[PDB]
């Protein structure tokens, strides 16, 4: 409807209340960082051979050299 009291929308009992409400996700304060302890960089990807988060080929060598 639209009327002198503004608009309204209405559903018969058993229609799905189809306007399901939506609300914000609540992520961590820091973004995920590189696993190498000397590296300030974000995670770009993770190693397939050992599972650690990484940011570069420099960190990929420096990780895999010591596992």
């Amino acid at each position: 409807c639209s009327g002198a009291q503004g608009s309204t929308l209405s559903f018969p009992p058993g229609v799905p209340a189809p306007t399901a409400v939506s609300q914000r996700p609540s992520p961590s304060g820091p973004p995920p960082r590189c696993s190498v302890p000397g590296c300030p960089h974000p995670r770009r990807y993770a190693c397939s051979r050992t599972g650690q988060a990484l940011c570069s080929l420099q960190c990929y060598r420096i990780n895999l050299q010591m596992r």
Binding site: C1, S2, G3, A4, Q5, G6, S7, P12, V15
Partner: protein, 439 residues
């Protein structure tokens, strides 16, 4: 301050032919002055155009450059008025790359026959009180609904149909909108919002100026007169949903079977009284631009019962017909020149020249002294009339730049020293004869 799209141009001062009801030319009236013989003749063919009984009659207006051939052509365009079609063509405009010459002339003819239709329809014009739209939970789609409309006097409820519901919801119609619905066409239109129900409201659904609530009875008649040329009837019929071709001009060389069929059905709408037919004018200005191929089309086009009254103008002497070797009068083949009446214009006196300059200065809002008119009248006989008509505004602007209220004789002598006559430029072209290219 305000300035509309049409402004002061080379014929804007002309507003008719200035004839009395006995069809005699007044010495100065409706912006026309002098030129009695051609104005008289133009009056007769104007009366023949208003009569409209006879098809394919034609006129050629002739005489010196700058002697009111086009003035008289615009004079009769304004005397004929907006309700009857007058098509101006400069003769070059038919040399299309999109379509051949005989097509471009057949379009110029058929653009100049009006078919006039009264569209009378019933409208509902009201302010939306409330709407209900009902939609199935899934189903086949059998939508249903109700709508309510008001005026300052009356209000009512409508039970809505299936195609109405999509046309309403397509234009986001809502309470407080003022709308005008055509019952025969099934089409909505939106006039604005009323000041009332728009207070029971949200973050904005629209932003426009409000409109006052509609008055009187909620259901009322409308009437429109369309003036549809034969050319646009042919174009609409050339391809389905072709309506944009009326603007873009992209439909070339239309099938003859369309014209043959529309010539019949336009006669049927006259015999039914369903539509008026109003034959108008085609003004082929500078017709000595047409090729002998195009004149030979006019010989046999200008004998159809659907032909408009055709007016040529031209300024040429014995000169060769464009696209051939042969010399002839007006640059036209006698094959055509035998068919149409010639209206002869005349050169101007001091009296006519001064009187033309005076009516021009009136339309351009200019004050000049009688001494400045005396020197400008001399200039308009020592040189062609259009150059004198070109000093007027320049002299008014130089007068304005020195903050004078009236153009003096030395304002015109100043401007005459500043902007050259052709006869003076073509004289200076003799000192620099080594420096200009390709003499």
């Amino acid at each position: 301050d305000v300035t509309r799209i049409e402004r002061i141009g080379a014929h804007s001062h002309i507003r008719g032919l200035g004839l009395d009801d006995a069809l005699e030319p007044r010495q100065a009236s409706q912006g026309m002055v002098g030129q009695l013989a051609a104005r008289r003749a133009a009056g007769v063919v104007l009366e023949m155009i208003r009569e409209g009984k006879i098809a394919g009659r034609a006129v050629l207006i002739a005489g010196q450059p700058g002697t009111g051939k086009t003035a008289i052509a615009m004079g009769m365009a304004q005397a004929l008025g907006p309700d009857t079609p007058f098509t101006a063509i400069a003769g070059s405009e038919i040399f299309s790359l999109e379509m051949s010459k005989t097509e471009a002339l057949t379009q110029a003819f058929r653009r100049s026959i009006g078919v006039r239709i009264k569209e009378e329809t019933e409208i509902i014009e009201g302010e939306v009180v409330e709407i209900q739209i009902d939609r199935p939970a899934t189903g086949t789609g059998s939508k249903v609904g109700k709508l309510t409309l008001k005026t300052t006097e009356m209000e009512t409820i409508y039970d809505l149909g299936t195609k109405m519901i999509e046309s309403l919801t397509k234009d986001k119609v809502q309470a407080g909108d003022v709308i005008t619905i055509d019952k025969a066409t099934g089409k909505i239109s939106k006039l604005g919002r009323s000041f009332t129900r728009a207070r029971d409201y949200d973050a904005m659904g629209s932003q426009t100026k409000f409109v006052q609530c509609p008055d009187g009875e909620l259901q009322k008649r409308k009437e429109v007169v369309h003036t549809v040329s034969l050319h646009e009837i042919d174009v609409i019929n050339s391809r389905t949903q072709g309506f944009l071709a009326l603007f873009s001009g992209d439909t070339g060389e239309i099938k003859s079977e369309v014209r043959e069929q529309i010539n019949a059905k336009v006669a049927e709408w006259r015999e039914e009284g369903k539509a008026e037919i109003i034959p108008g004018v085609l003004f082929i200005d500078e017709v000595h631009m047409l090729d002998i191929e195009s004149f030979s089309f006019l010989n046999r086009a200008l004998e159809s019962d659907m032909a408009p009254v055709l007016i040529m103008a031209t300024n040429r002497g014995i000169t060769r017909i464009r696209g051939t070797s042969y010399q002839s009068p007006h640059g036209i083949p006698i094959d055509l020149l035998d068919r149409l009446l010639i209206v002869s214009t005349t050169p101007y006196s001091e009296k006519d020249t001064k009187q033309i300059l005076r009516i021009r200065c009136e339309e351009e809002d200019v004050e000049m002294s009688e001494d400045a008119y005396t020197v400008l009248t001399r200039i308009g006989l020592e040189t062609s009339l259009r150059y004198a008509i070109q000093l007027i505004t320049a002299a008014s602007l130089v007068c304005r730049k020195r903050k004078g209220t009236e153009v003096q004789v030395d304002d015109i002598k100043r401007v005459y020293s500043l902007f050259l006559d052709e006869s003076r430029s073509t004289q200076y072209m003799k000192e620099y004869q080594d420096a200009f290219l390709f003499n």
